[PDB]
JSON list of C-alpha atoms and ligand atoms in Angstrom, two decimals:
[
{"chain": "A", "resi": 1, "resn": "UNK", "atom": "CA", "xyz": [117.17, 178.54, 107.63]},
{"chain": "A", "resi": 2, "resn": "UNK", "atom": "CA", "xyz": [120.53, 180.30, 108.19]},
{"chain": "A", "resi": 3, "resn": "UNK", "atom": "CA", "xyz": [120.23, 183.55, 106.18]},
{"chain": "A", "resi": 4, "resn": "UNK", "atom": "CA", "xyz": [123.22, 185.29, 104.62]},
{"chain": "A", "resi": 5, "resn": "UNK", "atom": "CA", "xyz": [123.71, 188.92, 105.85]},
{"chain": "A", "resi": 6, "resn": "UNK", "atom": "CA", "xyz": [122.61, 190.59, 102.54]},
{"chain": "A", "resi": 7, "resn": "UNK", "atom": "CA", "xyz": [119.83, 187.93, 102.02]},
{"chain": "A", "resi": 8, "resn": "UNK", "atom": "CA", "xyz": [118.30, 188.84, 105.43]},
{"chain": "A", "resi": 9, "resn": "UNK", "atom": "CA", "xyz": [118.70, 192.59, 104.63]},
{"chain": "A", "resi": 10, "resn": "UNK", "atom": "CA", "xyz": [116.70, 192.01, 101.37]},
{"chain": "A", "resi": 11, "resn": "UNK", "atom": "CA", "xyz": [114.00, 189.95, 103.21]},
{"chain": "A", "resi": 12, "resn": "UNK", "atom": "CA", "xyz": [113.66, 192.58, 106.03]},
{"chain": "A", "resi": 13, "resn": "UNK", "atom": "CA", "xyz": [113.44, 195.47, 103.49]},
{"chain": "A", "resi": 14, "resn": "UNK", "atom": "CA", "xyz": [110.79, 193.60, 101.42]},
{"chain": "A", "resi": 15, "resn": "UNK", "atom": "CA", "xyz": [108.70, 193.13, 104.64]},
{"chain": "A", "resi": 16, "resn": "UNK", "atom": "CA", "xyz": [109.03, 196.91, 105.35]},
{"chain": "A", "resi": 17, "resn": "UNK", "atom": "CA", "xyz": [111.46, 196.84, 108.34]},
{"chain": "A", "resi": 18, "resn": "UNK", "atom": "CA", "xyz": [114.04, 199.32, 106.80]},
{"chain": "A", "resi": 19, "resn": "UNK", "atom": "CA", "xyz": [113.55, 202.60, 108.70]},
{"chain": "A", "resi": 20, "resn": "UNK", "atom": "CA", "xyz": [110.51, 201.16, 110.59]},
{"chain": "A", "resi": 21, "resn": "UNK", "atom": "CA", "xyz": [110.03, 203.40, 113.70]},
{"chain": "A", "resi": 22, "resn": "UNK", "atom": "CA", "xyz": [113.15, 205.22, 112.34]},
{"chain": "A", "resi": 23, "resn": "UNK", "atom": "CA", "xyz": [115.47, 202.17, 112.68]},
{"chain": "A", "resi": 24, "resn": "UNK", "atom": "CA", "xyz": [117.75, 201.83, 109.58]},
{"chain": "A", "resi": 25, "resn": "UNK", "atom": "CA", "xyz": [118.06, 198.31, 108.04]},
{"chain": "A", "resi": 26, "resn": "UNK", "atom": "CA", "xyz": [121.61, 197.94, 109.56]},
{"chain": "A", "resi": 27, "resn": "UNK", "atom": "CA", "xyz": [120.06, 198.10, 113.07]},
{"chain": "A", "resi": 28, "resn": "UNK", "atom": "CA", "xyz": [117.63, 195.20, 112.22]},
{"chain": "A", "resi": 29, "resn": "UNK", "atom": "CA", "xyz": [120.46, 193.09, 110.59]},
{"chain": "A", "resi": 30, "resn": "UNK", "atom": "CA", "xyz": [122.84, 193.81, 113.53]},
{"chain": "A", "resi": 31, "resn": "UNK", "atom": "CA", "xyz": [120.06, 192.81, 116.05]},
{"chain": "A", "resi": 32, "resn": "UNK", "atom": "CA", "xyz": [119.42, 189.57, 114.06]},
{"chain": "A", "resi": 33, "resn": "UNK", "atom": "CA", "xyz": [123.19, 188.77, 113.97]},
{"chain": "A", "resi": 34, "resn": "UNK", "atom": "CA", "xyz": [123.62, 188.91, 117.81]},
{"chain": "A", "resi": 35, "resn": "UNK", "atom": "CA", "xyz": [120.12, 187.53, 118.71]},
{"chain": "A", "resi": 36, "resn": "UNK", "atom": "CA", "xyz": [120.13, 184.49, 116.34]},
{"chain": "A", "resi": 37, "resn": "UNK", "atom": "CA", "xyz": [123.30, 184.54, 114.14]},
{"chain": "A", "resi": 38, "resn": "UNK", "atom": "CA", "xyz": [120.66, 184.81, 111.32]},
{"chain": "A", "resi": 39, "resn": "UNK", "atom": "CA", "xyz": [119.21, 181.35, 112.26]},
{"chain": "A", "resi": 40, "resn": "UNK", "atom": "CA", "xyz": [115.35, 181.30, 111.96]},
{"chain": "A", "resi": 41, "resn": "UNK", "atom": "CA", "xyz": [115.24, 178.12, 114.18]},
{"chain": "A", "resi": 42, "resn": "UNK", "atom": "CA", "xyz": [117.14, 179.74, 117.16]},
{"chain": "A", "resi": 43, "resn": "UNK", "atom": "CA", "xyz": [115.40, 179.12, 120.54]},
{"chain": "A", "resi": 44, "resn": "UNK", "atom": "CA", "xyz": [116.86, 180.15, 123.95]},
{"chain": "A", "resi": 45, "resn": "UNK", "atom": "CA", "xyz": [115.38, 179.68, 127.45]},
{"chain": "A", "resi": 46, "resn": "UNK", "atom": "CA", "xyz": [115.26, 182.76, 129.75]},
{"chain": "A", "resi": 47, "resn": "UNK", "atom": "CA", "xyz": [115.92, 182.37, 133.57]},
{"chain": "A", "resi": 48, "resn": "UNK", "atom": "CA", "xyz": [112.21, 183.41, 134.14]},
{"chain": "A", "resi": 49, "resn": "UNK", "atom": "CA", "xyz": [110.99, 180.27, 132.19]},
{"chain": "A", "resi": 50, "resn": "UNK", "atom": "CA", "xyz": [109.96, 182.22, 129.04]},
{"chain": "A", "resi": 51, "resn": "UNK", "atom": "CA", "xyz": [111.65, 181.31, 125.71]},
{"chain": "A", "resi": 52, "resn": "UNK", "atom": "CA", "xyz": [113.05, 183.54, 122.92]},
{"chain": "A", "resi": 53, "resn": "UNK", "atom": "CA", "xyz": [112.18, 182.38, 119.35]},
{"chain": "A", "resi": 54, "resn": "UNK", "atom": "CA", "xyz": [113.59, 183.02, 115.86]},
{"chain": "A", "resi": 55, "resn": "UNK", "atom": "CA", "xyz": [115.82, 185.52, 113.93]},
{"chain": "A", "resi": 56, "resn": "UNK", "atom": "CA", "xyz": [114.86, 188.28, 116.42]},
{"chain": "A", "resi": 57, "resn": "UNK", "atom": "CA", "xyz": [114.52, 186.11, 119.61]},
{"chain": "A", "resi": 58, "resn": "UNK", "atom": "CA", "xyz": [110.90, 187.18, 120.34]},
{"chain": "A", "resi": 59, "resn": "UNK", "atom": "CA", "xyz": [110.01, 186.38, 123.98]},
{"chain": "A", "resi": 60, "resn": "UNK", "atom": "CA", "xyz": [107.04, 184.10, 125.01]},
{"chain": "A", "resi": 61, "resn": "UNK", "atom": "CA", "xyz": [106.68, 186.33, 128.18]},
{"chain": "A", "resi": 62, "resn": "UNK", "atom": "CA", "xyz": [104.65, 188.94, 126.07]},
{"chain": "A", "resi": 63, "resn": "UNK", "atom": "CA", "xyz": [104.55, 188.36, 122.27]},
{"chain": "A", "resi": 64, "resn": "UNK", "atom": "CA", "xyz": [103.80, 184.69, 121.27]},
{"chain": "A", "resi": 65, "resn": "UNK", "atom": "CA", "xyz": [102.17, 181.60, 122.84]},
{"chain": "A", "resi": 66, "resn": "UNK", "atom": "CA", "xyz": [104.33, 178.52, 123.56]},
{"chain": "A", "resi": 67, "resn": "UNK", "atom": "CA", "xyz": [101.88, 177.06, 126.16]},
{"chain": "A", "resi": 68, "resn": "UNK", "atom": "CA", "xyz": [104.63, 176.80, 128.86]},
{"chain": "A", "resi": 69, "resn": "UNK", "atom": "CA", "xyz": [105.10, 180.46, 130.02]},
{"chain": "A", "resi": 70, "resn": "UNK", "atom": "CA", "xyz": [102.78, 180.89, 133.06]},
{"chain": "A", "resi": 71, "resn": "UNK", "atom": "CA", "xyz": [101.29, 184.41, 133.50]},
{"chain": "A", "resi": 72, "resn": "UNK", "atom": "CA", "xyz": [102.39, 185.43, 130.00]},
{"chain": "A", "resi": 73, "resn": "UNK", "atom": "CA", "xyz": [100.63, 187.29, 127.15]},
{"chain": "A", "resi": 74, "resn": "UNK", "atom": "CA", "xyz": [100.50, 186.60, 123.34]},
{"chain": "A", "resi": 75, "resn": "UNK", "atom": "CA", "xyz": [100.34, 190.23, 122.07]},
{"chain": "A", "resi": 76, "resn": "UNK", "atom": "CA", "xyz": [101.37, 189.21, 118.48]},
{"chain": "A", "resi": 77, "resn": "UNK", "atom": "CA", "xyz": [98.54, 186.55, 118.56]},
{"chain": "A", "resi": 78, "resn": "UNK", "atom": "CA", "xyz": [100.75, 183.75, 117.09]},
{"chain": "A", "resi": 79, "resn": "UNK", "atom": "CA", "xyz": [102.19, 180.45, 118.26]},
{"chain": "A", "resi": 80, "resn": "UNK", "atom": "CA", "xyz": [105.92, 180.98, 119.09]},
{"chain": "A", "resi": 81, "resn": "UNK", "atom": "CA", "xyz": [106.67, 178.14, 116.59]},
{"chain": "A", "resi": 82, "resn": "UNK", "atom": "CA", "xyz": [105.46, 180.50, 113.75]},
{"chain": "A", "resi": 83, "resn": "UNK", "atom": "CA", "xyz": [108.60, 182.57, 114.63]},
{"chain": "A", "resi": 84, "resn": "UNK", "atom": "CA", "xyz": [110.95, 179.67, 113.59]},
{"chain": "A", "resi": 85, "resn": "UNK", "atom": "CA", "xyz": [109.72, 179.62, 109.92]},
{"chain": "A", "resi": 86, "resn": "UNK", "atom": "CA", "xyz": [112.13, 179.96, 106.94]},
{"chain": "A", "resi": 87, "resn": "UNK", "atom": "CA", "xyz": [109.73, 182.86, 105.99]},
{"chain": "A", "resi": 88, "resn": "UNK", "atom": "CA", "xyz": [110.38, 185.83, 108.34]},
{"chain": "A", "resi": 89, "resn": "UNK", "atom": "CA", "xyz": [106.89, 187.47, 107.74]},
{"chain": "A", "resi": 90, "resn": "UNK", "atom": "CA", "xyz": [105.59, 186.52, 111.23]},
{"chain": "A", "resi": 91, "resn": "UNK", "atom": "CA", "xyz": [108.85, 187.54, 113.02]},
{"chain": "A", "resi": 92, "resn": "UNK", "atom": "CA", "xyz": [108.81, 190.94, 111.18]},
{"chain": "A", "resi": 93, "resn": "UNK", "atom": "CA", "xyz": [105.07, 191.59, 111.87]},
{"chain": "A", "resi": 94, "resn": "UNK", "atom": "CA", "xyz": [105.63, 190.83, 115.58]},
{"chain": "A", "resi": 95, "resn": "UNK", "atom": "CA", "xyz": [108.96, 192.83, 115.72]},
{"chain": "A", "resi": 96, "resn": "UNK", "atom": "CA", "xyz": [106.98, 195.85, 114.38]},
{"chain": "A", "resi": 97, "resn": "UNK", "atom": "CA", "xyz": [104.66, 195.59, 117.45]},
{"chain": "A", "resi": 98, "resn": "UNK", "atom": "CA", "xyz": [107.64, 195.16, 119.87]},
{"chain": "A", "resi": 99, "resn": "UNK", "atom": "CA", "xyz": [109.61, 198.21, 118.53]},
{"chain": "A", "resi": 100, "resn": "UNK", "atom": "CA", "xyz": [106.35, 200.29, 118.71]},
{"chain": "A", "resi": 101, "resn": "UNK", "atom": "CA", "xyz": [105.86, 199.40, 122.48]},
{"chain": "A", "resi": 102, "resn": "UNK", "atom": "CA", "xyz": [107.67, 202.60, 123.64]},
{"chain": "A", "resi": 103, "resn": "UNK", "atom": "CA", "xyz": [111.39, 201.71, 124.14]},
{"chain": "A", "resi": 104, "resn": "UNK", "atom": "CA", "xyz": [112.21, 201.27, 120.42]},
{"chain": "A", "resi": 105, "resn": "UNK", "atom": "CA", "xyz": [114.89, 198.61, 119.80]},
{"chain": "A", "resi": 106, "resn": "UNK", "atom": "CA", "xyz": [116.04, 198.76, 123.50]},
{"chain": "A", "resi": 107, "resn": "UNK", "atom": "CA", "xyz": [113.54, 195.81, 123.83]},
{"chain": "A", "resi": 108, "resn": "UNK", "atom": "CA", "xyz": [116.38, 193.71, 122.29]},
{"chain": "A", "resi": 109, "resn": "UNK", "atom": "CA", "xyz": [119.03, 193.84, 125.06]},
{"chain": "A", "resi": 110, "resn": "UNK", "atom": "CA", "xyz": [121.64, 192.54, 122.50]},
{"chain": "A", "resi": 111, "resn": "UNK", "atom": "CA", "xyz": [120.73, 195.49, 120.20]},
{"chain": "A", "resi": 112, "resn": "UNK", "atom": "CA", "xyz": [121.31, 197.90, 123.16]},
{"chain": "A", "resi": 113, "resn": "UNK", "atom": "CA", "xyz": [124.57, 196.19, 124.22]},
{"chain": "A", "resi": 114, "resn": "UNK", "atom": "CA", "xyz": [126.13, 195.37, 120.79]},
{"chain": "A", "resi": 115, "resn": "UNK", "atom": "CA", "xyz": [124.47, 197.48, 118.02]},
{"chain": "A", "resi": 116, "resn": "UNK", "atom": "CA", "xyz": [123.18, 200.76, 119.53]},
{"chain": "A", "resi": 117, "resn": "UNK", "atom": "CA", "xyz": [125.47, 203.70, 118.55]},
{"chain": "A", "resi": 118, "resn": "UNK", "atom": "CA", "xyz": [127.79, 201.48, 116.44]},
{"chain": "A", "resi": 119, "resn": "UNK", "atom": "CA", "xyz": [128.43, 201.72, 112.70]},
{"chain": "A", "resi": 120, "resn": "UNK", "atom": "CA", "xyz": [125.31, 199.59, 111.88]},
{"chain": "A", "resi": 121, "resn": "UNK", "atom": "CA", "xyz": [125.46, 200.49, 108.13]},
{"chain": "A", "resi": 122, "resn": "UNK", "atom": "CA", "xyz": [128.47, 198.07, 107.96]},
{"chain": "A", "resi": 123, "resn": "UNK", "atom": "CA", "xyz": [125.84, 195.30, 108.28]},
{"chain": "A", "resi": 124, "resn": "UNK", "atom": "CA", "xyz": [124.24, 196.18, 104.84]},
{"chain": "A", "resi": 125, "resn": "UNK", "atom": "CA", "xyz": [127.63, 197.18, 103.28]},
{"chain": "A", "resi": 126, "resn": "UNK", "atom": "CA", "xyz": [127.99, 195.75, 99.72]},
{"chain": "A", "resi": 127, "resn": "UNK", "atom": "CA", "xyz": [124.34, 194.40, 99.69]},
{"chain": "A", "resi": 128, "resn": "UNK", "atom": "CA", "xyz": [122.37, 194.92, 96.42]},
{"chain": "A", "resi": 129, "resn": "UNK", "atom": "CA", "xyz": [119.26, 196.53, 98.06]},
{"chain": "B", "resi": 201, "resn": "NA", "atom": "NA1", "xyz": [103.20, 183.80, 126.15]}
]
């Protein structure tokens, strides 16, 4: 599924991401834009052999099991394929654990490089939330 901007904002809010660990909804939508372009099926291989999965490009190195990331953990206790679903429940649940890990949204390098400090509210601008 390719979400619309305001459609993803509504989904994330419903699943309790807005202001989770003090991160406004615009932060989550901005991170999704530059991680996945709002595409739930997005997969990208890392140089280390791990893979990033879904709207928030959750990494098989720590968070999900894809069976091909040697020496890796599955701290969200899910198959990485669960993170490609049209339903973002699993991605949100797991993203809650990632952002709680101590470095906040800095865990998403594209959040740090492209969203952090910017006018993130623009991302929910004109959305009926
Ligand atoms: Na893993």
